[PDB]
Design a protein around this nucleic acid. Structure first.
Lengths: 121, 58, 106, 172, 61, 197
RNA sequence: UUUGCUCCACACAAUAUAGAUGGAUACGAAUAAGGCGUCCUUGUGGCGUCGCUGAACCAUAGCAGGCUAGCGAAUUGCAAUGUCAUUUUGCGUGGGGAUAAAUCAUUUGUAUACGACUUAGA
RNA sequence: GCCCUGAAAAUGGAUGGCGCUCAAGCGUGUUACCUAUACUCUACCGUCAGGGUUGAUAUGAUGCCCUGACGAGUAGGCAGGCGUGGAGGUCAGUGACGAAGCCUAGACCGUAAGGUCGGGUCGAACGGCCUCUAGUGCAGAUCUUGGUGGUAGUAGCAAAUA
RNA sequence: AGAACUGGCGAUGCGGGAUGAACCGAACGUAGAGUUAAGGUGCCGGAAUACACGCUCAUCAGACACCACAAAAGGUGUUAG
RNA sequence: GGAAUACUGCCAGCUGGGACUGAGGACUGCGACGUAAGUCAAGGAUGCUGGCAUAAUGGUUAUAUGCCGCCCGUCUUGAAA
RNA sequence: GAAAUUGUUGAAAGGGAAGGGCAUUUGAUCAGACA
């Protein structure tokens, strides 16, 4: 489907570049003389609910599937009914002898694996 | 595509030349009837310096 | 012959703007020889091209083209607006674009 | 305000049972449309008679064109107006071809020379002058002599393109 | 904006379901939302709204 | 539609020529203003001299080399007028002044080229007759410009060469117009003159 | 110690566009005045003509632009730069060409905080 | 009426600047044009209100779909959520074939809090989900402790005879 | 300094008044198109070096209400009664 | 005396150019056209053709350019102070 | 074996600050349903 991402940027914190102690995780400026809370012109844009995504194309990858997280061969079997719908992303700690199993089971069942080139060797 | 086939395009199909000939030989008994027309079709069109395409009549 | 041109070389004036604010989606194109809004109604829909030269070669060409069309007339002097596909880069304020005659109604 | 149109307005106090035939009042009013003309009626009438818009009605409003709008006429205008300090009465003269063109020329001539707006001008009487001895203002008398030929010395050519390739000549 | 007559986005102050987590009461609301919506009788709207009522508003008879 | 445009700035009003140049040089047009010593400016003489001696007072107090520089040449008085009408503190405005050259007199690169004249900024079309105006050469040499006599000398050394050129070209068109009249009674001239030609 | 360098000739690669695609086509002065023509005793002169826009003038007929000494022009499929001009800088090819200085260190004191300055030394 | 005189202040300066004089000034009039997060139409998100829906496999009703309106906000109130240290339960979860950590102008998801993945490093434990519990979320407090800078190769290291 | 009535700022961004807590316009989910408000259209600056009738020459002219000032008194300056 | 033309208003008069949008996803409704078969611009886009499937076109990121952008916390009627 | 802070190498920018917002050019880089 044609997806439309509203506001593809990141919503960094105000002054998150100026100082190293503040991070780029977003925090609402609860100041009284703030020029970000007051929504001045030329300052950054805050999260509002208007920037939400379409309810048909929310949580969809650019490929067009919802990403799942598998951890074993049993966690693949919740996806063989929904192959167009769900992709499969092997978790970040599945060992290399266990990746070539479920990368090979998903080649049989036909699930579109998201990160197959991880820990390949 | 990695063949470079040239699927019968360098030379010509036989019957295609006659239909272009019949149309040409039927039209030139009208083009040469008026003066300076065969010289007018043989020269391309371009814009000069004062060519304003909203004012001049085509 | 050295007669080759089928466009009219307009300039790229600015973005559509107010005082102190500008909107980079709409650019103002000053076509040559156009002095009124009526007879700027001839060029509506005819498409422009901003041809420029780059250094790295793509598709075997060193010249890259940005297309786009003429949308509506601007005020009282034959300025027109234009909506390019990718907007013009604002280094081209006072840079020749070429209004073609491609969707023609003559 | 705008391009003037002379109206006439007939008005009337609303009748009652004691007097179900009140007298009609006529004004010749230069205004810009039918709505401003009906407001200028109840302005000059209410400064003359015990009647408001609420107490009276308007009998008829018509437009008055001219019988000869292709003949010059030495108009003679009586006008009162409020200055910045006091009120005055005046008498100017206009030359223009149409009666409503003289009132347009009058309001421009008063807003320039005395800074008197539309809201501070009451016209009194606009009358064509029939013979050439009643004209008594010098700036009209020069256009009333025999063999009126004058030249136009300094002609300017309004340009369309922004550059020219010869020094322009103002000769006529 | 509009010149707002009365307050915007105000919840109507009536509950639409019980505060409780009683499963054996949630099935009684699954019975009486069917009845009160598919029967024109006004008794069922009364017992529907009365099953939401808190213990203070539901005194012993 | 000329790439280089040479403007004959004799009898042009200063601020009206400087406003149809700032708008033109911001649209990408290399404009060369020429003989700016004959520019005009409205108002009488000492009124404009007093509007310049008010400008000469305005300098930085603590170091007078910091403040406004009072350029005195007539090319630089017009360049002061143009630079006000361009946003010259940016990269658009700085590039729009790299397309402008102004001289007083006509230099040897520009004496053989055509000179055009802006009609909406001439004195003899805008100023009502009887008004007192001011030539920018006489004003600028009264506030400290030293080369007015040089520019008047070099201009007379080139007016006698351009008059020499015109007499050669006038005798050219004399023997062409006296020759083309025999080529007028043809049939193609009878064929072309009905075409507006 | 023909490796250096200078310049002129294509074979290049290459980088960079404040933005080439018919022609920047030349009297001066005056504007309550001039241009051009035309004779005349040569003038601050007679006579004719012109302006009211350069929308002019000059160029422009072919494969992105031919020829045998009248023929070549197709299928680049219905549009997609459909190119091509410059400013530079290195490298080959051969045609010539010229055969130095400055700084530091040492010195001087007309100079001097240090730099700088001014001097002298095969 | 306009203009001028009356009308004098301290750094150099202000119709915003340039500049303008049949205005690019003033008075008045007629049109055309430019443009705000306003108005109109459309999309999408959310919130609120009103409806439809136990036909029937998401059996299902925390939903499902239909309709319309609305959206600023400090102090403040309530709601839905993310994150953390430990606890009961479950995934017969992950792991020396590399757990946790840390780095990464590499990728993806979410309006956001944050979640997931690739690479590098590294070496022994750690997560998801349903619930329980609190010594649970930092930019400030002339905050506390520890660490490090610019200043800075700077001030200077010159009394007591050598 | 002090009260009465409303409106606003506080608590509020936006377009305009160059600039500004309060004035004019208008109050805000995220975008696209269209049309305007207040103010503007020589150039900086998007938009008429438009049109129409006048007035005005200042050796400190004058130009966007709040608003960043000016008076009595004058003048055969000019224009009009 | 007879017209005509302005100006204002009306048309469920005809007609041309351009821009932005294509939400929804079996049918049902309304209404035209039709003798009928059905067809339709009538409860939201399709038809045809071409190019590309490699870096076309998108994402991030650095810089350039146009326009805007004062330093946060804080007490305060009012803080960039 | 994190950050402050520092060194070498690589990229880029730089006329009296730096940083940020919307938009695109240019370079770098990443990409997948049809692949």
């Amino acid at each position: 489907p044609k997806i439309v991402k509203k506001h593809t940027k990141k919503f960094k914190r105000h002054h998150s570049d100026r100082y190293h102690r503040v991070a780029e995780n977003w925090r609402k400026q609860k100041g009284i003389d703030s020029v970000v809370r007051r929504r001045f012109r030329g300052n950054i844009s805050q999260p509002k609910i208007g920037y939400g995504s379409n309810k048909k194309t929310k949580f969809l990858s650019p490929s067009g599937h919802k990403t799942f997280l598998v951890a074993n061969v049993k966690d693949l079997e919740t996806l063989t009914m929904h192959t167009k719908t769900y992709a499969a992303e092997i978790a970040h700690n599945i060992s290399a002898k266990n990746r070539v199993v479920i990368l090979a089971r998903a080649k049989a069942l036909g699930i579109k694996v998201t990160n197959p080139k991880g820990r390949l060797a | 595509a990695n063949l470079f086939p040239e699927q019968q395009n360098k030379e010509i199909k036989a019957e295609r030349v006659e239909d272009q000939k019949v149309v040409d030989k039927a039209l030139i008994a009208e083009i040469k009837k008026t003066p300076l027309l065969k010289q007018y079709l043989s020269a391309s069109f371009s814009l000069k310096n004062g060519d304003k395409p909203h004012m001049l009549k085509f | 012959a050295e007669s080759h041109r089928l466009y009219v070389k307009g300039k790229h004036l600015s973005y559509q703007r107010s005082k102190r604010v500008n909107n980079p989606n709409v650019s103002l194109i000053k076509i040559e020889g156009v002095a009124t809004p009526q007879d700027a109604q001839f060029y509506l829909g005819k498409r422009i091209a901003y041809v420029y030269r780059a250094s790295k070669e793509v598709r075997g060409s060193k010249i890259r083209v940005m297309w786009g069309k003429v949308t509506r007339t601007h005020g009282n002097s034959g300025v027109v607006r234009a909506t390019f596909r990718n907007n013009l880069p604002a280094k081209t304020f006072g840079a020749s674009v070429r209004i073609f005659l491609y969707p023609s109604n003559i | 305000m705008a391009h003037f149109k002379e109206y006439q307005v007939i008005g009337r106090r609303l009748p009652t049972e004691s007097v179900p035939e009140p007298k009609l009042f006529r004004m010749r009013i230069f205004a810009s449309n039918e709505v401003i003309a009906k407001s200028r009626y109840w302005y000059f009438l209410q400064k003359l008679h015990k009647v408001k818009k609420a107490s009276g009605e308007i009998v008829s409003i018509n437009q008055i064109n001219e019988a000869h709008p292709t003949k010059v006429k030495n108009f003679g205008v009586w006008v009162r107006y409020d200055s910045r300090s006091g009120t005055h009465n005046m008498y100017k003269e206009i030359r223009d071809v149409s009666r409503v063109a003289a009132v347009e020329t009058l309001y421009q001539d008063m807003a320039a020379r005395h800074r008197a707006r539309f809201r501070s001008i009451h016209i009194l009487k606009v009358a064509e002058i029939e013979k050439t001895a009643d004209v008594k203002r010098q700036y009209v008398k020069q256009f009333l002599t025999k063999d009126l030929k004058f030249p136009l010395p300094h002609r300017v050519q309004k340009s369309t393109k922004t550059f020219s390739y010869k020094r322009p000549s103002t000769f006529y | 904006g509009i010149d707002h007559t009365s307050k915007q986005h105000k919840r109507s102050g009536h509950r639409t379901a019980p505060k409780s987590d009683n499963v054996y009461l949630k099935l009684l609301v699954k019975l009486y939302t069917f009845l009160a919506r598919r029967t024109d009788a006004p008794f069922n709207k009364v017992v529907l709204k009365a099953l939401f009522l808190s213990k203070i508003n539901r005194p012993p008879v | 539609s000329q790439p280089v445009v040479v403007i004959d700035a004799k009898d042009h009003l200063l601020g009206r020529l400087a406003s149809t140049i700032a708008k033109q040089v911001l649209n990408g047009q290399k404009i060369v203003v020429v003989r700016a010593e004959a520019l005009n400016i409205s108002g009488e003489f000492f009124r404009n001299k007093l509007k310049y001696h008010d400008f000469l007072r305005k300098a930085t107090a603590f170091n007078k080399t910091r403040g406004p520089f009072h350029f005195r040449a007539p090319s630089r008085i017009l360049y002061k007028a143009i630079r006000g009408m361009v946003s010259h503190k940016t990269a658009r405005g700085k590039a729009a002044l790299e397309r402008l050259k102004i001289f007083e007199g006509i230099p040897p690169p520009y004496d053989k080229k055509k000179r055009v004249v802006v009609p909406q900024a001439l004195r003899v079309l805008r100023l009502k007759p009887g008004r007192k105006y001011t030539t920018l050469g006489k004003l600028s040499t009264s506030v400290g410009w030293k080369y007015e006599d040089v520019v008047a000398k070099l201009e007379d050394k080139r007016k006698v060469r351009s008059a020499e050129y015109y007499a050669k070209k006038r005798a050219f068109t004399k023997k062409v117009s006296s020759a083309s009249a025999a080529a007028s009674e043809s049939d193609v001239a009878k064929q072309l003159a009905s075409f507006g030609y």
